[PDB]
Design a protein around this motif. Structure first.
Motif: not given
Lengths: 362, 362
Positions: A204-207, A210, A235, A289
């Motif tokens: 859900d997040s790219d963290e 990244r 997505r 998530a």
């Protein structure tokens, strides 16, 4: 398109609407589906199961065997490794000392191939090759025996090339690693390899993706190679993901059908424990998530790589020939081909549908 | 050693003696033998059949399918091709124009591999590569469709390397060819390749193998590569040939067993139409000038090559590593290894018994 699959697709659409999906419709697909029948029947079996579980909610051994079976039956992993290796060979030609960082090593064969290639490259054999390996999730929570054996095997191979060689593992979670953990040295060229690995970090997040792409960039690599499943399962919303996944897995299931017998137990293991589980993750109950094991298409990957400061590197003039060579013995019943995707991706396709894409970045 | 095979061996010995062999002994072996059982049972089936035929006397399609099956299940042809190619690559490094003469081409894959390797060799890609191909007996009496397709396929591949390339066939019998038929040019390096071919010319007389080795020498090759079955089935007498053949084919049959299912029809085709026919030729009725398809061990080949004026060329420093790389994915149940035979042979072995030997000469 086969009626059982068109019926499945209308099921997913009905499911996502307000009236909802009628039990008779899904029951008809489930009746027609079979994990022992033709590819479209097997495919519908695993998808209809996942759709049921979605509606109802409102191992390491399996995988390792599966991986071995898949790669004996299909050219996917060899395509990816050899195409990545050619890019590493070309990027690191001017270096006499090379350091490979493998995020998600499984067995050693990519690096045995690369060592052989480096030993015979135009610029002459390197004076030192180091490999730092982060174990793939395919090796499970207990990768030590497997890594140690790979280490031994690669070091024995390097002795037969007359090259100074080292291999070390990193066992801590990647989210805890830092640049200093890789022990990079100023006089060596670094190549970073992500083969069928980075999609595990999409979320859900790219963290997490990244954090590891920044980590790779901080090693100042000569090249970063990326090999990924070519399917947009990140997505996009449920009805699109279901359609994307169904088309993608239809090609995979068909390529298994040409390669193995209808009664092969090994084949079912792959279809159920590798593909079936992935299908559950993409199209099953979980959302937001909670949805894991996402995959992305090549345009999305390009956006992420450029966002992290990388630029495309053209693949070798001899990457298409090397990939044709690999496919040489697949007779006429096989439907493999190579497809270019922009700007600089090379993908192995089934019936002209890209399935596994390789690219190089710096 | 398995009792059924020891009983077979005593049968051959009895057969060659004055009293002769008792029907009860051979009948017991034939009863125990089965073309559907374990490797030793299948092996005894084909050998007991041949022994019966010997005592009683006092296709192209099969083979081509067999060849394909064998090479999908086993590393024999890949081992041979890649090891030969490495020797050609090294011998021809100083040349910008290369001419390959292939005595006994089957499909094009050896040369597709070599083209890829030449394109990336240290000295830089050649400006021209020509191939002259003599069709293998495996292609049958009607090789034109197969050769034309191979020609097309190799020329399309060479386009993807950016190299000037030509392929032509020679369809007349090799015993009628002369140096001028190969159209060799003074500015090109020549390599001559004999992969699983020359044994077809061995006979009561050496004249045909002599004629073609002299023909090869007259092309002033940079190197001649030889790949041959490692079994002494030429001038030895019947009891020794039977023992040599039984041990050799036992290893081959066992390597099929680890690779394919007990009920595979493809497997039986290989065992009957390729191996079984060879067994008939070696151990069946025929003798003297009537005995054909002889095979020789590496010492005999060395004697013949030196007799024709060739000298051994050491194989690459990277031939053992390349052969280990090829074997990398054969798991623990496989029993392949590499064995050196003097002075400069490299052989692929099963359970430490050499089966397929490659060497280079000039």
């Amino acid at each position: 398109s086969a009626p059982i699959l068109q019926s499945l697709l209308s099921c997913s659409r009905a499911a996502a609407t307000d009236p909802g999906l009628a039990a008779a419709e899904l029951a008809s697909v489930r009746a027609a589906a079979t994990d022992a029948g033709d590819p479209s029947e097997r495919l519908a079996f695993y998808f209809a199961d996942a759709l049921s579980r979605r509606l109802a909610c409102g191992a390491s051994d399996e995988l390792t065997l599966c991986y071995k079976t898949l790669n004996d039956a299909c050219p996917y992993s060899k395509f990816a490794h050899l195409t990545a290796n050619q890019a590493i060979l070309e990027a690191t030609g001017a270096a006499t000392k090379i350091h490979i960082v493998d995020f998600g090593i499984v067995q050693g064969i990519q690096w045995a191939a690369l060592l052989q290639a480096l030993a015979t490259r135009p610029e002459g054999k390197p004076t030192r090759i180091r490999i730092t390996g982060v174990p793939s999730p395919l090796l499970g929570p207990q990768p030590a025996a497997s890594l140690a054996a790979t280490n031994t095997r690669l070091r024995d191979f390097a002795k037969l090339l007359g090259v100074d060689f080292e291999f070390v593992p990193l066992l801590r979670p990647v989210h805890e690693l830092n640049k200093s953990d890789f022990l990079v040295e100023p006089d060596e060229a670094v190549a970073v390899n992500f083969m069928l690995q980075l999609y595990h970090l999409l979320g859900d997040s790219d963290e997490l993706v990244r954090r590891v792409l920044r980590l790779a960039k901080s090693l100042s690599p000569a090249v970063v190679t990326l090999g990924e499943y070519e399917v947009s399962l990140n997505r996009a919303g449920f009805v699109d993901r279901f359609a994307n996944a169904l088309s993608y897995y239809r090609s995979l299931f068909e390529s298994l059908d040409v390669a193995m017998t209808r009664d092969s137990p090994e084949r079912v293991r792959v279809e159920r424990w590798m593909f079936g589980e992935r299908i559950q993750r993409a199209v099953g109950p979980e959302e937001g998530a909670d949805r894991t094991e996402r995959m992305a298409g090549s345009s999305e990957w390009q956006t992420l790589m450029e966002w992290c400061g990388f630029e495309p590197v053209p693949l070798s003039n001899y990457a298409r020939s090397q990939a044709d060579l690999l496919l040489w013995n697949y007779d006429s019943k096989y439907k493999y081909s190579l497809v270019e995707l922009p700007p600089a991706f090379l993908s192995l396709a089934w019936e002209k549908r890209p399935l596994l894409t390789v690219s190089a970045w710096r």
